[PDB]
């Protein structure tokens, strides 16, 4: 356990990671100790570097939107969604085939409408 | 598997550092405790973002140091078993390959690359599957799922991460997509 009790825990795309991890980082930027970032916390940072697929605030609020489409997508699974970005039925069946509950076509269709929009274009 | 945490902690904010704003002592006070583990529940230990609360500093008997309870935020990364990964193949070895995913590498061996015969093809350092001509390589990008994780130590480099590619909709990025509804060219 870090610290005596935790309050609270939420979990967060690779793209929210990449904004935090960049603000630790500029954190040294600390003068009087410095404080370089550890060796596997530079790599988290340069692998979400490269995998964020979406900037920092539309991934939140595709995150926030998945989680509002369905009971059984809950923010785990939201943030998962984000991270991946699945195109078609085969990348949802993957992605919820450990999971409480597998999308019919249908439903899986809705998701992947929904991604359809936020899907970077560049 | 990226997550945000919400601590409550006592931190112990030494006498040298008594001219400094409470709030940013105790934050790098938290930083030199926690930052550079493996917390076995949490997983690993990736930043103090900032300290949001800290209580008025009590002062004990003995000890010039001021203690305060502080609450703060905390990044953190763990690899969660089943979890659908993605990642850059940082090592080929003639046993299977590292693949970055990515404070943490994750080990994909030759008989769960993929659904075909593999052998590693030592003068170009990599894989190749018989039928399927399936190529994997340093640098190449795949998709795979977490099928085990041990967590020993604090020490993340002892800790170890176990995945497949060989199920539907993993692998290679290249194998994916022409997996996809061109095998549906229905």
């Given at each position: ?8 825990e ?11 991890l ?13 404080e370089?970032?550890?060796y596997?916390?530079?790599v ?13 605030e ?11 489409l ?45 991604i359809?929009?936020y899907?970077?274009?560049? | 598997?990226y997550?945000?945490?919400?601590v ?5 904010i030494?006498?040298?550092m ?21 917390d076995?529940?949490e ?40 979890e ?6 940082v ?6 390959a590292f ?61 170890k ?26």
């Amino acid at each position: 356990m870090i610290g005596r009790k935790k309050l609270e825990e939420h979990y967060i795309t690779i793209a929210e990671a990449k904004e935090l991890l960049e603000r630790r980082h500029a954190e040294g930027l600390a003068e009087n100790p410095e404080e370089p970032m550890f060796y596997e916390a530079r790599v988290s940072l340069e692998h979400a570097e490269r995998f964020a697929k979406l900037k920092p605030e539309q991934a939140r609020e595709l995150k926030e939107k998945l989680m509002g489409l369905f009971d059984w997508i809950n923010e785990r699974i939201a943030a998962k969604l984000v991270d991946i970005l699945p195109e078609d039925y085969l990348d949802i069946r993957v992605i919820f085939a450990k999971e409480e509950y597998m999308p019919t076509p249908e439903e899986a269709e809705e998701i992947i409408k929904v991604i359809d929009e936020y899907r970077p274009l560049e | 598997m990226y997550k945000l945490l919400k601590v409550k902690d006592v931190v112990r904010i030494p006498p040298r550092m008594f001219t400094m704003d409470p709030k940013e002592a105790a934050k790098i006070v938290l930083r030199e405790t926690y930052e550079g583990i493996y917390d076995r529940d949490e997983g690993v230990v990736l930043a103090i973002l900032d300290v949001e609360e800290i209580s008025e500093g009590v002062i004990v008997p003995g000890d010039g140091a001021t203690y305060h309870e502080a609450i703060f935020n905390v990044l953190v990364w763990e690899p969660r078993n089943q979890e659908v990964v993605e990642g850059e193949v940082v090592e080929m070895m003639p046993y299977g390959a590292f693949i970055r995913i990515g404070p943490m590498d994750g080990l994909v061996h030759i008989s769960q690359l993929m659904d075909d015969y593999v052998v590693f093809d030592e003068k170009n350092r990599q894989f190749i599957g018989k039928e399927t001509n399936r190529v994997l390589k340093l640098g190449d990008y795949v998709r795979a799922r977490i099928i085990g994780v041990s967590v020993k130590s604090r020490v993340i480099r002892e800790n170890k991460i176990n995945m497949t590619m060989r199920q539907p909709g993993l692998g290679k990025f290249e194998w994916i997509e022409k997996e996809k509804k061109k095998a549906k060219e229905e």
